[PDB]
Each structure stands twice: as C-alpha cells, then as structure tokens.
Amino acid sequence: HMNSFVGLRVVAKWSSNGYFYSGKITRDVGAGKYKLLFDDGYECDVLGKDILLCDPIPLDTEVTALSPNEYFSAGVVKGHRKESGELYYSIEKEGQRKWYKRMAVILSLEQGNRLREQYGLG
C-alpha cells in the first residue's frame, strides 16, 4: 500500500540488543526487512517489527537520554526543534528540561514497545 519507505527517518533495533537507535531506511531488501543506515554510520538489515516509523519521536514519549557522566537516564520528550538543520529533543528529567542531540536519545525495549501499536512496521 505504501509508496516507499526509502528515505524515511526511523528509530530501530537489531536482534540481541534491546535499544532503538535513530536512523533512516536506505533500501527495501524484501523478506520483511529493510536496510537501515544508523546516524552513527552503521548499516544493517532490520526486521520490520523492529522499526518505529516516527520522526521526531513524539511528545510525551518516555525515552532514554544519554546524559553527562556517561549516564543513561530515562526521561520524557517535552519538545523538539531544529537548530541549523539538526534535530534536538527537549527531555524532561527530575522535573527539569534539557536539550539533547538526536543521537543522544534512544528507546529501551519497554519504551519502544509502547510505540509499536501506533508506529511499528510489524
């Protein structure tokens, strides 16, 4: 039904790793899989059920923000904005909000499962 998923930004995980990372679909490789180019440069084929077609990550989503002191901490998306073409998320934690670059925001398995119903490609 869909014209094409190529070029769409997503957050996706591979198997045996429980986090979703931001990336983009570069190719429909069939077999229910898509070639995903992660923002860090890593590229591999991922199952449709492991892809959340949401960009930006919606507001009021509980996410995992990579934080100072190599600290991964759960927080809630309260805003996003483009800064010279780059997407930044406003994440609320301990009742305070801070800006994080796109790549510093990931989803744990539980956090991503909450979005599968609405945004998953399963």
Query: What resolution in angstroms, rounded to 1 decimal?
Result: 2.2
- Where does the chain hold its CATH 2.30.30.140 domain(s)? 1-57
CATH class held by domain 58-122: mainly beta
| CA–CA dist 38, 22 (Å, integer) | 6
Distance CA 1, CA 4 (A): 9
CATH 2.30.30.30 intervals, the chain: 58-122
Q: Assess whether the previous peptide bond of 68 is cis (omega < 30° from 0).
A: no
Q: What is the CATH number of domain 1-57?
A: 2.30.30.140
Q: After which residues is the chain broken (C to N over 2.5 A)?
A: none
For residue 66, the cross-strand partners are 72
Residue by residue, what is the 3-state secondary structure of the chain?
CCCCCCCCEEEECCCCCCCEEEEEEEEECCCCEEEEEECCCCEEEEEHHHEECCCCCCCCCEEEEEECCCEEEEEEEEEEEEECCEEEEEEEECCEEEEEEHHHEEECHHHHHHHHHHHECC
* CB-count burial class (<10 Å; 0-12, 13-18, 19+) for 14: middle
Q: How many CB atoms lie within 10 A of CB 7?
A: 8
CA distance 22 to 41: 11
Expt. technique: X-ray
